Amino acid sequence: HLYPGEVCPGMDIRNNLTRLHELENCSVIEGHLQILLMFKTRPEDFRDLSFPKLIMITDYLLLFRVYGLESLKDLFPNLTVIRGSRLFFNYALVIFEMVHLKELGLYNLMNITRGSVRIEKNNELCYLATIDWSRILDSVEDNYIVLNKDDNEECGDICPGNCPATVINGQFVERCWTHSHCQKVCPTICKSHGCTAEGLCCHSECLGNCSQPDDPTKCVACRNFYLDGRCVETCPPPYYHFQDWRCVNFSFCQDLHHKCKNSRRQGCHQYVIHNNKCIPECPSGYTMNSSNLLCTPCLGPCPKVCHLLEGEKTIDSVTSAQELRGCTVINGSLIINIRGGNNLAAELEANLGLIEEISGYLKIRRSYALVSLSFFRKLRLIRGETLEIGNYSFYALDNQNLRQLWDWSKHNLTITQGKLFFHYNPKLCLSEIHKMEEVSGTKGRQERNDIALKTNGDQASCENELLKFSYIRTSFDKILLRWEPYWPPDFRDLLGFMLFYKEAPYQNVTEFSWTVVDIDPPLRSNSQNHPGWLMRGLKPWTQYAIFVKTLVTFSRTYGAKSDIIYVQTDATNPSVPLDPISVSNSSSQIILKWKPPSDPNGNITHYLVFWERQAEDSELFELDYCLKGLKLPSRQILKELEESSFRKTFEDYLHNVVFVPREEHRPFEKVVNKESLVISGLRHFTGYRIELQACNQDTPEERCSVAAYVSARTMPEAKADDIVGPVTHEIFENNVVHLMWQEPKEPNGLIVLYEVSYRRYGDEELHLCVSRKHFALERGCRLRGLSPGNYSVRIRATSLAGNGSWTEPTYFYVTD
Amino acid sequence: HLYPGEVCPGMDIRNNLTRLHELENCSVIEGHLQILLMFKTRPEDFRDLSFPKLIMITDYLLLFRVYGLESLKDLFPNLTVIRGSRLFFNYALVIFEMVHLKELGLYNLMNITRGSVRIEKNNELCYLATIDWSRILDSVEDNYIVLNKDDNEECGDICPGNCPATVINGQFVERCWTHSHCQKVCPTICKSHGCTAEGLCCHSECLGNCSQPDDPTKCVACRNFYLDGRCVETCPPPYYHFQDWRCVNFSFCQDLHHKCKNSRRQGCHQYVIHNNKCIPECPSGYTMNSSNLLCTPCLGPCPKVCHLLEGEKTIDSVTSAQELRGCTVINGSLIINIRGGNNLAAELEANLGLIEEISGYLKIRRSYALVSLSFFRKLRLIRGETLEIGNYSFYALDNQNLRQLWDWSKHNLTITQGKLFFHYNPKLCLSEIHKMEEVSGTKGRQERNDIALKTNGDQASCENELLKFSYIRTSFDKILLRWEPYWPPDFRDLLGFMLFYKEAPYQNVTEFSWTVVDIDPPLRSNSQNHPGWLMRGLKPWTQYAIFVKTLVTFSRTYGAKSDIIYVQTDATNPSVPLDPISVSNSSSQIILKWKPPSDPNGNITHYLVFWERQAEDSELFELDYCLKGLKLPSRQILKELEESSFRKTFEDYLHNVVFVPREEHRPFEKVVNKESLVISGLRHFTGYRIELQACNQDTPEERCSVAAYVSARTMPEAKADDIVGPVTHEIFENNVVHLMWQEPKEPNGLIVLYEVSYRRYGDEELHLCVSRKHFALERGCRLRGLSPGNYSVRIRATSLAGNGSWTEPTYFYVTD
Amino acid sequence: ETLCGGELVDTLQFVCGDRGFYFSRPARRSRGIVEECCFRSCDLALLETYCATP
Amino acid sequence: ETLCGGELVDTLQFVCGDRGFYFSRPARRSRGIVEECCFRSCDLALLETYCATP
Amino acid sequence: LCGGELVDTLQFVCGDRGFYFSVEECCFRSCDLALLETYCAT
Amino acid sequence: LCGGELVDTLQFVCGDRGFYFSVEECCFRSCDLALLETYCAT
C-alpha cells in the first residue's frame, strides 16, 4: 500500500511529550528521529501514545534516557525498515541509558539497510538473547550489546515457541520479540524480497513485508525506489532520484532549490541535477548553471575543495567520514583516530579515497582496527601548509594492527614539507617506512629518533633476509637439520640461531606453543661449515613445521629467517592394540575385541592373531579332590646479551690502543580393516591362549608390533560329563564288587572323581570316592562289604565343570 | 732487601725478542710493561730468557698474542706486587689471545693494590681454577676469566696438595700455581703485612713477602712508601712523595722539572711541589711560581680547565676517567657509556665528582651498571655551548638500571641552554624527571616526545599515590581484605585493582611467583563503599605479604598502590603424626615412633596417646584347629583495555552531540617435646590397640588432631605355655583314663589344643586332640582302650604362640 | 571538582531543572561538554548556560 | 669486504709481514682501527700504512 | 563450594549479624564478596 | 642417553662412514651435534 501522510523530515523530541504530536500524519521520515532527555514522565503517560502510521526511518533512531518507557511495542508498532543513509557514530539504532525499559517491542522490524545496533547500559531490559539479528542486519559482528539486564541478571525470556526457532552456534532457540509476538522467519528463497504470513514469496522488488505476494502495488516497503505507491526499481524520466529512496518530477527539485536560494537558511543546500539525481551538489568537474539546474561539465580541471573548520577534523566514526564524501581537495588537516575493534575499511573507502590533495598534514593516532592505509585510493600529494606541531607532515602513534602502509608496486605519493614520524607500530616494519621515505622524496629530511628502530615491528618477523636449508632427512625416530651459514657484516654480533618447531596438523600454520632451542654460533670457517642442529624427541608420522631465525645484537639489525618448511616423519612399529577383550557366546564361537593402538604409527594393513591349544595343568593330575579342602577352581637474558657486547667492546679498545697509523602353526588369520574377530571350531570346555599383535606394513617386510596375551575359555557341552556304557560289575568270593564303566573320552576338561550311590530297599545311600589313580590302578571302582539284597546303584561323575547327572538306578541282586 | 737496579720506566716489547734485553738491570718499573705481537717466535727461544730482578710493577702488565710462550714461570719468577696506579681498561693484568700458554707460572704474585685481572681467549691455558684470587686481589667479583681451556676442555689440574687448600663455595681445594709451586697461604693475623715460609709475621709496613720477619730493613715490597731500602710509612722532609710509591730529595724533582722544561718533550710534565708531593701539576687554586717550584695558592678563583680533544670524550673505563682526575672545568662534552655488568661508582666518584661546570652537553647512553648519577658530587652548571645534535643538553638512552638521578634534598643544578631527553630507562621514573625539570629551570623548554611516558619506569612501581587498608582480620582458615576507595579525576578510567599476595618466610620481601587476582571496580557510591576482596585458599600460620595496585588506562596516569603489609594467619588443628611405627623389644616394653605432621599448624604442646586392651577374637574360640586345614595364624589483554576505552569514547561523543551551549580410661600420657614414647607394664603375648593423636594447644581448650590407629603385639614369656600341676588320671571299670591337669591360667593368649603321647615299653607313641570343648565338657582328656602295661606319658600344650614343651614322662601301670 | 560522563547527566536536570535543554539545529565545535567539565574543571555558570529559557 | 676484530690481526702480519708495526709513543684520535675497517670497508693501503719501515 | 558447606563464608564476612539463605551465586559462578556483604542486612 | 644405546645417533649423523668410540660428552653433557660430526672421520 502507498504512504498516506506527510513525509515530515526528521526531528527530535525533548523535555515534554507534548512535542510528540508532530508525527500524527507520518508514514515516512526523511531524516532522523531522536526521543531523549525525558525526566518528568511516568509509565502512565505512555499507555496512550501510538504511531501505527510510521513505516520507514531514513537515517537512524536514537533513544537516550527516556524515563517511564517500558516497551516500544506501543510506540512504533509498524517500524518496518531503517534505511540508515546517515548513521549516528556508525550505528543505525542507538538505545543508551534506557532506564525502565523491559522489552524492545519492535516486532515489525524486518531489515536494516546500512549500519549497526548498539544497546547498552539499560540495567532493566531483557528479551535480547531471544532475537535473531542475522535476518535483520547484514553484519552481526559489528553490533555492540553489553551491560544490559540479560548478562548480569537472569530475567526469564519466557515466550511462545509455536514460534519459529533457529540455531546460532550449536543449538536451536526460539526467536521472539515480546511475550506475545515473535520474529517472522520464512524460507531463504526470499532472501530480502519479503514473504506473507502463509509463506508465499512477495515481489522481488519488495522488502520486509507485503500484503499481496508478487504484487509491487500492495507493498509496504520496496528496496529500490518509490513513486506514486506502485514503486519501480528505477523510475523513468521526467522523474529524478531523490535522497536514494524516492524520485519526483523536476518541478519539485527546482522549487526546492529556489526555496533554499531565496530563503538564506544556513542548513539548506542549492540542489542540482546530475544523471537524473536531485543531489545537493554534484562532484568536482561540473558548474552550477543558472539557466538549467543541471551542472554541465566544465572546460577546466577545477576540483571540489573541502574547507575544514579550524583547519582540522577528527575521523573517528562512519558519520564523521561521511561529511567528506564526494570531496577531493581538503583545505585543512586530517586526524584519523578510530578507537574500535571492528575494521572500517569498507566504509572509509566508500567515503574517503576520492580525495587527492591535503593542504595540511595527515595524522593517524591510536587507531586499532586499521590494518592498512589502502583506503586512501587516490591520495597523491600532501602539501603540509599547516604543518603539525614539531614540524611534521605524517604521524603514526600506537597503531596496534598497522600491517601495510601502501602498495608501492603501483601507488604514487608526494610530500612537500615536513618530516615523517613513526612510533609504536608493532605490526609495521622499517622496510615499509624506508619505502615511504624513498618514494615520498624527503630522504634528506630525517633526523634521529623520528623512526624508532626498536618499536616498529618488534613483534613482526620482517628482517627480509632469507635462509636456505642445505639438506635434511628424517629417520625411523628422529630428524637432523642443516642450513647454509649466515654472517652479518660484523661476525661478532651473531649470537646464534633460534630454531622453532611445532606439530602442524594441516598444511597451513601461522607464522610466529612454538617450542624453541638455542643454537651455538658456528666457528669462523674463513671451506665453510654449515651450523646444523639435531632434534631430540618427537612423535613419529607427524607433519612438523620448522624454521630458523637468527639472533643478532642491536648495534643496523641484519638478522635472517627461513621459510616455513614442513617435514614429514616416517612411520614405525605400532603399539599393542588397546583394550584386548575376548568373549565367548557359543560352543565354538569366541569373539575377541580390541581397539587400535594409542599411536598407530602406521597404516594398519592387517592384524596377526594366533589362538593356541594348551594342556591341562600338570599339578591338577597329581592333586586329590576328595580330601578336605577340595576347592577345585570353577574353570634474565639481558646479561647474556651484554656479556657478548662487553666482550666485544674490550677487543675494540685493545685494537685501537695497540695499532697506531703512521614357527608353530597356531591357526591364524590376517584381520584386515577390522578391530574385531570371530573364531569358530573350538573344543568344548577347553581354554585358549590368544596371542594378539598388529602390523602396519606387509609388502616391504612385515613391520609388526609386540604380542598381546589374553586368555579365553569355552563353555562345555550339554551331556559330555555323563558316564556312558553299561555299569558292569565283577563279584568275587568275598562279595567284592569291581565296577566297570567307560570314561567320557571327550569330557569337560577332565573328570576328577566319581560318586557312587547304591541303596537297597529300606536301606540308605552310601558314597565312595573314585579318583583318577583309583580309576586307573583298580580299573574303576572296587566295592567291598555289601549287605545282602538288591541295591539301586546311581553313579555321579564329577568333572572340572561340576557334578554330572546321576546315572539311572541300576539294580543288582546279591545272595541273601 | 733494597732494589739494586735502574728504575727503567715502563716500555713495550714488540716484533722481536732482541728488545727484551732492556730489563737486564730492573728491580722496579715506574710504568707499564707490554709484551705483545710476537709471531716469528718458538718455545725454543724462550727457555733462556729470565728476569729474577723484576720485583714490582707500577701500572699494569699486558700480554697479547705472543706465540711460543708456554709459561711465565721462567719469565717473571719474582713478580711480587702490582701497584695498578693506572689501569688498562680497569684491568691491572690483561692476558688476551694468549696462544700456546699452558700455565700462568706467576708463583711469586702476592698482592694487587688496585685493578682487576682479565684472562680470556687463550684456548690452551689451564691451571686456572686451582688458584685463590681472594688472597691476591681485593674485589674478586670484578674479575673476568672465560673462554679458556679450563671450561670447554678438561685439562687435568694435577699438582701437589701437601700444598695448602681452602674452601671457595662449599668444598676445599688445593691452591697451586704450577705443577711444582703453589700459592703461599698463611694465617689471617697477617692480612697483607707478609709472612715468612715458616709462618712468622713480617713487619706491619711490609707487603707480600719478607726475609727477616718484623724487620722493614729486609723487606721485598712495603705497601706505604720507599726510601734507601729501609722504607718507612711516610718519609720526613726534605723528601717529597713521588708517584705514590717512593720519595726523593727536592733536587731530583727540581732537575726533572728543569729537564722537561728545557727539553720540549710532548709527553713531559712540568712537575711542581704541593704538600711534600712532586706531582705533575697541583690542582685548581694554585699558581706555578718561578722562584720556588711549589705552587702557592692564588689570590683569585681560577679553576683548572680541562681542555678536550674535538670537544668530546667517551667515558667507558676507569682509565678513561682517570685522565680527568683533578680537573674541575671541562672545555667540552662528556659522553658516559659504560658497557659493563659490574658497578664502577667508587672509581668514578674518585676520579670524577671534582668537576663543577661542563662547557658542552652531558650524555649518558647504553650504560648498564650505573644505578645512580650521584658520583657527580660537585656538578653545578651545564653551559651547553656545544649543543648536542638535535639541540639537547642532557641525554639518556637504554639505561637498564638507572634507579635514581640525583638526591634533590641537598643537590643543586643549572642548565643554560638545550632541553632534556629521556628514553628507555626502565628503572627511572617520571617523578625524578619532573624534579629534574623543576630544579634545572628549563620548564618552558620542553616539547612532545622528549620524555616518553610509557618507556621510563615501565617496570618500576612509582606512581607515588599511597593507598590505605580500612580493616582486615584473618580467621581460622581464610582472610578477608578491605581498603579505602580510590578514584582518578575521570572515574571511567579505573578498570579495577590488582591484588598481589605471596608467602613471605621472613619479614622482608622484595617489592614487585606473586600470584595475582583481578578486582572489579566498585560501583560509584557518590556514603562511600569500600572495594574489598575475599581470598580463596591458603596455607595457615604463614606470614603473607599483601599489597594492592590500581590499574588505570593510559589516556595522565594517576594510579595508586599500597604499602607491603604483612598479615599473619592464625593456627589450626594438626594433621596425623607422620609415619606411626611401633616396635616391641621387651616383655613389657613397647617403643612407638612417629614424626610431626606434615603441617603442624600449631606449636605441639603435647601428644595424647592411648593404648587399649582387647579380647581374643570371638571366632577363634569357636574354631577347631585339629581339623585338616589348621593354619592357625602366627599371632590478549589489549582488547579488554580498548573495550573500556571504546565504551568511553562513544559516551563522550553522545554528550557532545546532544548538549549544545547557548571416656574409657585407657592409660595415656601427655608426651611433651618428644616424637617418641616408651611404654612399660604390658601383659605377655597380648596385643594392643594404640590410638595416636596430637594436640597443639592445651590451656585455651585442647585443640587436638584426629586419631591414628596402629597395632602392637608383645612377645610371650619363657615357660608360660607349659602345663603345671600333677597329671591326675581316673581309671574306670572299662580302663577309661580320664586325665586331670590344671590349665596355664596365664597362657600365651590361649591354648587351643593338647597333645598326649603315652608309650609303653616296646610299644609306640599315640596322639589325641584335646580341644577347648574337649577340655571343658570332659574336664580334660578321656582315654579309652589302653593296652596292659606301664606307659610313659608326655603331654604337649599347643597355644597361640606354638607347641609347648613336652611334659616329663609320666608312668602309670594298668593291670596285665 | 571535575565531573565526567555518566554523572554529568545527573548533575544536569538538577542545576537546570524544571525546564529542559534548548535545541535549535546542528548548524563540530570540538568544545561541547567533555573538554569543558570532564577534561578540565568547570563552574556553575558553564552548566547554567546550557539551559533553555535562561 | 669488511673485516673486524679477531680476524683483523690475522689479516695483519700478512699484509704487513716480515717487519712489525711501528710505535713511537701514545702522544685518543677516536679513529684508530675499528671505525676504519670494521664499521666501514677499508682497502689495502689503509693496512699498509700501519707497517713500520714502509 | 556449595550449600551447607558455604555458611562459614557468610559467617566470616558478616560477623554477628545473621543472614538469609540465598547458593546459585558461587556453586556455579564465583564468590566475589560483592553479593556476600549485601546478603546480610542490618 | 649413554653408551651402547647412543650408537644409533652417530649412525644417524654419519651414515655409511663408521666411527670410533668416544660417551663422556653426552651422558653428562648435551648432544649439540657439534662433536658428533667430527667423531666420524673420512
Residue numbers in the entry:
A (entry chain A), B (entry chain B): 1 to 161, 168 to 518, 528 to 541, 545 to 573, 577 to 656, 691 to 717, 754 to 907
C (entry chain D), D (entry chain F): 6 to 32, 37 to 63
E (entry chain C), F (entry chain E): 8 to 29, 43 to 62
Give me lines lifted from the publication on this model.
Insulin receptor (IR) is a receptor tyrosine kinase that plays critical roles in cellular signaling, growth, and metabolism. IR can be activated by two highly related ligands – insulin and insulin-like growth factor 2 (IGF2). Consequently, IR-B has an additional 12 amino acids at the C-terminal helix of the alpha subunit (α-CT), while IR-A lacks this segment.
The 3D reconstruction of class 1 (determined at 3.6 Å resolution for IR-A/IGF2, comprising 16% of the particles; 3.7 Å resolution for IR-B/IGF2, comprising 14% of the particles) exhibited a T-shaped symmetric conformation with four IGF2 molecules bound at the canonical site-1 and site-2. The site-1 binding of IGF2 is mainly mediated by the interaction between A- and B-domains of IGF2 and L1/α-CT and FnIII-1 domains of IR in a fashion similar to the site-1 insulin binding. In addition, the C-loop of IGF2 also makes weak contacts with the α-CT, CR and L2 domains of IR. In contrast, the site-1b interaction in the structure of IR/IGF2 complex is mostly driven by the salt-bridge formed between Glu12 of IGF2 and Arg539 of IR. IGF2 binds IR site-2 (the side surface of the FnIII-1 domain of IR) in a similar fashion to that for site-2 insulin binding, but their detailed binding modes are different.
